[PDB]
Design a protein around this ligand. Structure first.
Ligand SMILES: [Mg+2]
Ligand SMILES: [Mg+2]
Length: 113
RNA sequence: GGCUGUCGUCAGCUCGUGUUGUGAAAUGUUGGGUUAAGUCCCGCAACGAGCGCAACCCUUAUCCUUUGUUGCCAGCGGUCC
């Protein structure tokens, strides 16, 4: 099952009871995730993800925090998928129809940079 | 009506969209700095915009080009200086 070498799942008491099923944990006053449930989760996850992908679908990666920021400007910045590695501008998706023309500007700047 | 004084040349006053709240409303315009300034930077469920601040206007301080009378006299002669 564990095709995933090393990511035992941090965070100690600061937990969330909604996250009981996916837990086997209890070590050194901190939770351990679950082998036999992390792996099964690709099941519904990589299945649908690589299907909508086949149907030609935009992806968009999201990962703020300067601890994996350019680590998403990566093989996510390789395919027809996209990314957000910094500040998530509130409403860039629900208010897309406004934020869109902040892009139109970016374009005008790099189109003369 | 038009025009004017006043707070005050104070740094303020608002809207679109989005989002939050049953709602009046909120956010943006909190906050950390910074500035003469809602000035700017960072931040941030906000993203942007309008009036305002600033700039564009005039004048003042240095220089340059063009211009030389009614303005000017440095080097030239003459002197009723
Ligand atoms: Mg302004
Ligand atoms: Mg002005």
């Amino acid at each position: 099952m564990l095709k995933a070498g090393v990511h035992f799942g941090h965070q100690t008491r600061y937990w969330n009871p909604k996250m009981k099923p996916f837990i086997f944990g209890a070590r050194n006053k901190v939770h351990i995730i679950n082998l036999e449930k992390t792996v099964p989760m690709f099941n519904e996850a990589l299945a649908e993800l690589n299907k909508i992908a086949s149907r030609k679908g935009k992806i968009l990666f999201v990962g703020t925090k300067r601890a994996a920021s350019e680590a998403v400007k990566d093989a996510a910045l390789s395919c027809d998928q996209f990314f957000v590695n910094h500040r998530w501008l509130g409403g860039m998706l629900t208010n897309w129809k406004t934020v869109r023309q902040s892009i139109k500007r970016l374009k005008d700047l790099e189109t003369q940079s």
